[PDB]
Every structure is written in C-alpha cells, then in structure tokens.
C-alpha cells in the first residue's frame, strides 16, 4: 500500500524550472557529511 | 455452434473404417500419429518465425532509412 521509495524517489517540489543575504551561513556542522557522530543504539528484535 | 470433428486434427473415420466396432477392442484413442505429429509441428511453425523475423527487420529498416533521409 505505501510503496515506500528508497534511494532516489521521484516526487519533488522545485524540479525543472523552479528558481525564480550575506548574514546567513552554515555555523559549525550543518553539513551532511560532517558531524562525526552516530545515532542512538536500539535493541531490535530480528525474531520475525 | 456445430461439432463437425471428433478430434480437432483427425476427421471422422470413413464408415468402412469401422469394419468391427463389435467390441471395445479398437478405440483409435491410441493415436499412432502423436509422436510423428509433434515433430512435424516444429518445422511448420518455425518457418513462421523465419518469415516474421525478417519482416520485423525490414520494417525497422524502412524506419531507419527515412531517419537518415530526414538527416
């Protein structure tokens, strides 16, 4: 029912002809590839 | 609709064909043409492909030739 897409997907907001202040910027680690941290550990079951 | 053929392949046997039918000792259900019929069926259709595969090629060619002609 859901049809959950994975890596690429196909639904977008500003796909084809979208685009119509110096104060703003990235502060420390807003970047995706930085942030040498990992999420919390969850038990998980695997029982199925 | 009608029912003219006892079997889609074999027509009804000639009335002289059933000289007996006195007892259930002959049935004509044993084929005796089965193995032969299958093998012959192979080639009869295969030509059909042989005819068709060429046709699809030329149809494509006419499609391809024009493109350059436009080119």
């Amino acid at each position: 029912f859901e049809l959950s897409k994975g890596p690429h997907s196909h639904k977008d907001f500003c796909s084809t002809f979208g685009r119509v202040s110096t104060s703003d910027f990235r502060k420390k680690n807003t970047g995706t590839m930085g942030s040498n941290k990992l999420p919390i550990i969850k038990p998980f079951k695997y029982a199925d | 609709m009608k029912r003219v053929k006892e079997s889609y392949f074999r027509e009804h046997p000639h009335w002289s064909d059933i000289n007996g039918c006195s007892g259930a000792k002959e049935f004509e259900g044993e084929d005796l043409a089965y193995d032969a019929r299958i093998k012959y069926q192979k080639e009869t259709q295969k030509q059909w492909i042989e005819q068709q595969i060429r046709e699809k090629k030329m149809r494509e060619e006419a499609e391809r030739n024009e493109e350059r002609a436009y080119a």
Partner: protein, 439 residues
C-alpha cells in the same frame, strides 16, 4: 521427470554461471545456439538433457538459468557474448544502480523494486517442472550486491517453497588474500542470514583454490577464468548421479538427510581429486587407491582449514569413471585405519559413497587433463569453527572504533544489527566445540 533450478546472484556467480553451464552443454553436446545437432547419447538414454533443459517446442534448448544483478556491465556481456543464443532473453535480469559494497543498500534499499521479479521469474519456471528435485543457490559472501539480494532471496525462499529443500554454494573471504576493505562486515551479516535458512552449504574460500594451481597444474599466472572451471567440475560431479546411469546413484535429496548432525551446524566443506595436468599425467598411476587417499590430503582441500585440527562428522563421496566396487571398499578400509584421521565418538560410519561411469568431459582449451578417475568430496567436520573465528576476530576489531558505520547507518538499517551478528556468530562457535567433545 527430474529437474533442478540454479540461482546465481552477484558478479562472482555471474562469471560462474557461464563457467558452470558451459561444461554442462558440452557434456550433452548441446549446441551453443540451443539447437543441439542431436545424437543418441552414450549414457542413461536420451532423457539426460531434461534435468538441465526443457523442450523448446521448436529449435533451441533453454537452460533453467535465472540471473539477477544490480549492475549492467558484467551481466549484459552474456547478452552479447558467444552464448547470445543460449539463455532466454527475459531471464537474465539486471538492474540500474550498483550496491557500492554496502549490505544495507543490498538488504534495505532496492529490494522490493527488483526482488519482486525474481520470485515472479522463478515461479514461472517452476510451474513447467513436475518433480523438482531441489534448488541451488550460488553467491559471493563478500560481494556487496549478492549478500543483500541473496539473503533477501534466501529469506523469501523459506516462505515461498518451505519444505522445498535449498542447497547453496558460497565464497567466503580469503584469510590474507583480500579484495575489499569492508568485506568482513557484509560477510558477517551475510552468514548471519544464511545460518537459519539453508539445509546444506559449502565453503569455497578463494585462496585455497588459488594454491592448488601452482602445486598441481603448474601454472604461474592464473586468472579468475582458470578458477571457475574447477568450480564447474565439482558441481558436475555432485549432480552427475541425477541423470547418468550408475550402480548406486545418489540423488540430491540424500544430502539434507545424511550430511548434518543437526539442522543448525550444516556448514560443510568439499574437496576434489584427482587434479593432475597431462604434463605430469605421464607418471602418476591415476589409480583408485592413490586417488582416494589424496581426497584426505591436507593441502588439496578446497578451503584453507587444516583437517588435522578437528574430527570428521560426516563426509559424502561419489565416484565417477570406471572404478570397480571392490577397490572402493578397500579405499575406505585403509582410511579408517589411519590414525591421522580420527572420527567422532558417536558416528560409527561417516561415509556415503557414490559411483559413476561416465568420464568427465573436457572444456575446450582447458587446463584439465581428462582422466578415468574422479572423486567428489563433501565433508562436514568440527574444524570449520576456526574459519568463523578469524572472521569474528576481524569483526570485533573494527567495531571498537565504529569505523565505516554511518554509510550503513544511512541506508535504513539500525545500529543494533551488529550486536546480534556477533552474538549469532558467537552463539554458533561454542556449538561446534561442544559436539566435538567425546561423551
């Protein structure tokens, strides 16, 4: 009325599919275009082709080969290779994107979009078959693509065919001759998957097969092409009993009911013999007596595990050629005498013996020297614990600093997956030592 279906997932298998199937066709002489020039055969009538092929209605003979891959480069080569005329067009399935050596991508990213057809493809093939003997699954453990789909393939099989027995051949990473830098991770998980869903398995470590080449065939610069043929030869011997007439045939079914002490510990290793190039075939007697003993030599084993560090629980050997029944019995008799090979206390007889007449065929331009002797070896011993140990020994080391973890994190898999992988791997090895302790 007997047929088999072989599943090859991942590049490693893909190069195996061409190798494995090429031997079979020549074995029958099935012509490359698929339309065998036809012959009266020399063994077991003319029905032998049924197992590996089905009548085409008119013309060729399509193998029951279904190929799945996430990359086009390796696969499509078959679509334009010398065997363009062999496989059916819509059964060599390839995707679009490459796994990039990540299991989570292989097990939680592109499954549904592509795993769906594999069941769809396989089901259609099965419906034609009537008395299916079983299935064979071939994949590379260290291959990023195969581990996910395969495990994805394996898990789904358990519900798809249930009682339908499943037999598999994997390729674990080499202890020191390695290829990738993250192979242990997906391997540990990959084995983690297949512990609970395969009746019988086999290990084919790369290095071990590497060594035999220099010692026996006397070749100094081999490439993956050389390796596959050996893998092909073993498979042919294993499946020989199905179609070729023999005094005591051994069907595939008699592997999940004869070679496993328990449903859990089913990882068994195979061997091969004799392996002598005709360069030196001018001297070796190539007799039954010597060949049988060579089956128990330590160096020739198909995996780099020393049998002398463990016992023998179950071993399956099926012969092919012009061996005499009397000689074989003598072959076993001597082996049990040797103290160097010691069996467990609760296993009185640890041998199911197979015999075959037809001599193995020769691949064109190959390195094998066709002989009148051949032994196919299948053994499940207590020695197989260590191979897991080394993989575990690696897996623990990297985890301490959580290396290369995020990229698996970003594919949807949770971090706790590892804990059960170590425990499930850990939960096993203790089992192997226990059964090996005499009562």
């Amino acid at each position: 009325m007997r047929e088999v279906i072989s599943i090859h997932v991942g590049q490693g298998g893909i190069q195996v599919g061409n190798a494995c199937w090429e031997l079979f066709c020549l074995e029958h002489g099935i012509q490359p275009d698929g339309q065998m020039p036809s012959d009266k055969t020399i063994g077991g009538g003319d029905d032998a082709f049924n197992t590996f092929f089905s009548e085409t209605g008119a013309g060729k003979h399509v193998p029951r080969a279904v190929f799945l891959d996430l990359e086009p480069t390796v696969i499509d080569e078959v679509r334009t290779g010398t065997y363009r005329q062999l496989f059916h067009p819509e059964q060599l399935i390839s995707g679009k994107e490459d796994a990039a050596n990540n299991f989570a991508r292989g097990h939680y990213t592109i499954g549904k979009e592509i795993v769906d057809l594999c069941l769809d493809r396989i089901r259609k093939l099965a419906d034609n078959c009537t008395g299916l003997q079983g299935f064979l699954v071939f994949n590379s453990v260290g291959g990023g693509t195969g581990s996910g789909l395969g495990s994805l393939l394996l898990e789904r099989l358990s519900v798809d065919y249930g009682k339908k027995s499943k037999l598999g051949f994997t390729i674990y990473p080499s202890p020191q001759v390695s290829t990738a830098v993250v192979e242990p991770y997906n391997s540990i998980l990959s084995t983690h998957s297949l512990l609970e869903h395969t009746d019988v398995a086999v290990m084919l470590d790369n290095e071990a097969i590497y060594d035999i080449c220099r010692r026996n065939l006397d070749i100094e610069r081999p490439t993956y092409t050389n390796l596959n043929r050996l893998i092909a030869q073993v498979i042919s011997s294993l499946t020989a009993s199905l179609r070729f007439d023999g005094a005591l045939n051994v069907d595939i079914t008699e592997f999940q009911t004869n070679l496993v002490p328990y449903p859990r510990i089913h990882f068994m290793l195979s061997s091969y013999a004799p392996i002598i190039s005709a360069e030196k075939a001018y001297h070796e007697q190539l007799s039954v007596a010597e060949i049988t003993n060579s089956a128990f030599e330590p160096a020739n084993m198909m995996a780099k595990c020393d049998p002398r560090h463990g016992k023998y629980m179950a071993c399956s050997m099926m012969y092919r050629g012009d061996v005499v029944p009397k000689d074989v019995n003598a072959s076993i008799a001597t082996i049990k005498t040797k103290r160097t090979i010691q069996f467990v206390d609760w296993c009185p007889t640890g041998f199911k013996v197979g015999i075959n007449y037809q001599p193995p065929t020769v691949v064109p331009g190959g390195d094998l020297a066709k002989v009148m002797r051949a032994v196919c070896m299948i053994s499940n011993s207590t020695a197989i614990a260590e191979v897991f140990s080394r993989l575990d020994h690696k897996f623990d080391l990297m985890y301490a600093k959580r290396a290369f973890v995020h990229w698996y994190v970003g594919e949807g898999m949770e971090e706790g997956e590892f804990s059960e992988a170590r425990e499930d791997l850990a939960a096993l090895e203790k089992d192997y030592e226990e059964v090996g302790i005499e009562t």
